[PDB]
Ligand SMILES: COc1ccnc(NC(=O)Cc2ccc3ccccc3c2)c1
């Protein structure tokens with residue numbers, strides 16, 4: 001037993017991290033096959049960020065202006081293009097460490113592991129979730145743009161995120177590996193306030209089921225509720241509406257503990273209205289929403 | 305900006321994980337050079353665990369009784385020995401993925417990354433800390449024994465922990481890579497209640513400094529304290545005593561924010577006596593003690 005925010009092993013992804021420099025700007029790039037993916041703002045000078053015209057800026061750039069370095073060996077750039085907000089640098093060498101991969105655009109509420117990088121070097125790995133407002137609460141400094149978010153399906157790396165921006169609230173913005181930002185964020189140095197960050201209700205329910213599996217059962221009561229009654233209380237606390245599909249997704253957790261989904265919703269309603277009263281669940285004093293029901297089932301079974 | 309429980313990249317460690325089977329028991333092993341390290345309880349049957357005599361049990365075992373598998377290739381065991389609570393299986397092949405390494409016995413309060421494994425396969429990575437009572441709050445299931453705890457000094461992996469036991473409270477027990485358990489734990493299926501788990505005060509101070517760096521300054525007050533006055537309040541809340549060495553360790557964080565260590569102790573005293581009042585610090589509703597001051601400085605600087 002035990003419950004932790006566990007990230008996927010980062011080994012396969014580490015073998016893909018490279019350093020991309022353009023002018024005085026160095027950031028991280030994802031080297032897959034003979035392509036290096038990186039946030040297109042690598043071409044901007046700090047003044048250009050204020051109101052950038054990426055196509056105009058990119059006209060002044062040639063292949064030899066992008067320095068790509070995998071460890072300490074320099075890679076030769078033989079082509080460059082812009083796809084949405086990512087530059088794809090075709091190199092003369094295919095990454096021999098390229099794992100089996102996919103580019104996925106994840107749904108809000110889904111989780112992924114981040115391999116935070118500086119100068120093409122992996123520094124740390126941690127778990128994140130795409131918030132319902134399309135921001136992520138990561139840990140990024142200057143030099144971290146180009147860090148990637150990913151999941152692993154046994155041996156296939158599903159890249160879902162690339163870090164590009166820090167927002168005024170301290171949260172982060174990024175794109176899928178096709179250069180499209182999640183949400184309404186643009187790669188411009190302008191204040192882009194995020195929307196209301198709602199709670200991923202299904203994830204909280206999955207983590208309350210993980211808490212039951214672990215031995216923390218103080219919050220379980222003798223009450224039940226209905227989807228409609230639950231959503232009246234969830235809406236008040238900025239919780240995402242609960243659907244029958246969410247109830248079905250919770251199936252293996254509801255069966256494992258023997259506790260009905262609606263019975264757990266009733267316990268969540270009482271935690272929302274009455275608080276934790278100084279108590280904790282899985283060592284947390286608040287309701288955790290960054291474990292999808294898949295993460296909980298995986299951790300409480302034995303998947304690798 | 306942003307603050308997360310970040311683990312070191314697990315790539316170097318993944319290349320060392322193998323599966324060790326003995327009888328019907330399969331667990332994980334650490335393959336470094338021509339040696340495979342594993343918890344010696346791999347030789348026990350579930351009945352043997354009740355009161356094991358490891359030397360007697362190990363007499364009935366030969367090299368051919370230990371099955372070592374690195375991925376899907378079988379490794380040949382040409383020697384076996386017991387060192388404290390770890391079996392060292394000498395194999396005929398040196399691990400070509402062996403990174404530069406060290407075996408360290410960490411101090412209580414120190415942190416490390418865990419690469420949780422099942423059948424020699426890495427499943428997840430997360431950060432842990434050695435509690436002052438020598439337990440860890442990990443996430444382990446059956447098949448996870450032999451999972452390792454480690455730190456990385458640029459390119460050198462310092463292995464500090466090997467998972468062996470789950471304790472009645474749900475916490476875990478393990479050994480350093482020389483087979484000595486941290487704490488008074490023994491590899492026997494007997495109830496071994498842990499001692500009082502105290503709070504690593506210095507780690508909470510480092511994480512309160514990280515919170516200031518991040519923009520969360522609500523808890524900062526106009527008060528100060530002395531080491532002796534702070535420790536009177538810390539003792540009451542089961543907090544570890546604060547020494548001048550802890551104050552010195554906090555140096556780069558105290559300089560970075562400009563806030564004296566004793567001024568931050570005063571804010572910690574008010575958080576202890578008055579609680580959080582429904583507020584949060586770095587998205588947590590309780591005082592986090594699993595970021596050493598080194599982790600905080602590292603995350604709030606740019607180390608890889
Ligand atoms: C390379 O350029 C990058 C990289 C990463 N993040 C950014 N972010 C921004 O510029 C957005 C921002 C953030 C905070 C503000 C705070 C106040 C007033 C405006 C603000 C605008 C730019």
Ligand SMILES: COc1ccnc(NC(=O)Cc2ccc3ccccc3c2)c1
Nearest residue numbers: 345353468469470471472492493494495
């Ligand atoms: C291979 O053997 C292993 C592996 C991992 N953990 C264990 N742990 C134990 O046996 C200790 C324990 C835990 C919980 C109890 C609860 C009640 C009564 C006694 C208890 C004893 C043994």
